Structure formats: C-alpha cells, structure tokens
Design a protein around this ligand. Structure first.
Ligand SMILES: Nc1nc2c(ncn2[C@@H]2O[C@H](COP(=O)(O)OP(=O)(O)O)[C@@H](O)[C@H]2O)c(=O)[nH]1
Length: 163
C-alpha cells in the first residue's frame, strides 16, 4: 500500500481493490468520452495540503468522505479532488463548460486529470450539481456547506471531523 498521487490529491490505500474498464461516459456538456471506470469498493487515506481525510468509493460513486478541520482552501480542494477521483455520476454531470482531451498539438490528455483541472476552477458548479443532505446529528461529526462552513446541511457523503 504505497502513497500515490492524483494531481494535487495524495492517496494511500486502506482496503479494497478496483478493476478498471473503459466506458463511454455522457458528461454534462452533452459530449461522450471514453473513460477508464474503476469497479469495486475501495477505501483510501487522502490528503490535499494540510487537510487529511478518508475516502470510500464504489463504481462511479463517492460512498463517504471523512475529512478533518483544516485550512478552508485545503478542505475545499480535497473535497473537489475526492469527488473527481470517485468518478461519481454527479461529478460527470457537473461539467457544463468545454473540456479538451487533446492539446493544441494534438497530443493525448488524461480524461481524469482534465476533469481535475476543470473542477478545481469550477467548484460552485460541482457543489450545486452534487446536492446536499442533512448534517449528522452526532456531536463528534459536523456538516459542511459550499462555503466550507459548519452548516445544518452538508455536501452529500461529506462530513467533517475534529476528533
Ligand atoms: N479507484 C482507484 N483509482 C485509481 C487507482 N489507481 C489509479 N487510479 C485513478 O485512475 C485514473 C487513471 O486514469 P489515467 O491516468 O488517464 O489512465 P487511463 O485510465 O488508462 O487513461 C487516475 O485518475 C488515478 O487517480 C486505484 O487503485 N483505484
């Protein structure tokens, strides 16, 4: 179980194993792109800057995201990166603008990496499309909104912890 990188996201496997299969994905801007889709339940230690976390996912779905309280810029980006990495259906739907999977030279670009670059710049569109749910009643767990503040409603699957 090695530490590996997905752009600004650092991961370290806790449990589970994923199997990748190329699938045609209809993303939000109406275009269809072939993307390697991971199948299986996986759990990771995740990090973005000073923000630590635990990510749980299945095939094209973020099951849960446990993050610590830290720098709000790092909390936000970690959530963004984990949403993209999870390959959640809501994340693909959040792509409203144009994404190029080829540069101007005609070279091949990584679809997943391009999605990261896109949503790091378009977080509001992602959060709105992602949806919200009731924050946990538990005292040791709090919800978090689009402004990275403690709220009665939280981003779906995302809870902040300060234990
Ligand atoms: N769920 C999961 N994702 C992984 C694993 N290893 C790599 N990835 C992600 O899968 C994506 C690989 O996409 P890419 O680099 O374009 O390779 P490609 O699918 O062959 O085009 C990257 O975003 C990685 O972060 C893994 O073990 N489990």
């Amino acid at each position: 179980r090695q530490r590996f990188r997905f752009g600004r996201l650092e991961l370290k496997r806790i449990s589970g194993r994923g199997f990748k299969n190329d699938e045609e994905i209809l993303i939000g801007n109406g275009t269809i792109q072939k993307i390697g889709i991971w199948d299986g339940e996986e759990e990771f230690h995740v990090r973005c800057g000073e923000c630590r976390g635990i990510l749980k996912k299945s095939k094209m779905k973020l099951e849960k995201l446990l993050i610590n309280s830290a720098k709000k810029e790092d909390m936000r980006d970690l959530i963004i990166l984990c949403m993209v990495f999870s390959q959640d259906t809501r994340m693909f739907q959040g792509v409203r603008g144009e994404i190029n999977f080829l540069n101007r030279a005609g070279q091949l670009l990584s679809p997943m990496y391009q999605l990261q670059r896109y949503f790091l710049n378009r977080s509001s569109d992602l959060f709105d499309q992602w949806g919200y749910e009731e924050s946990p009643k538990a005292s040791e767990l709090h919800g978090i909104n689009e402004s990275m503040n403690a709220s009665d409603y939280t981003l779906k699957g995302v809870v902040v912890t300060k234990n």
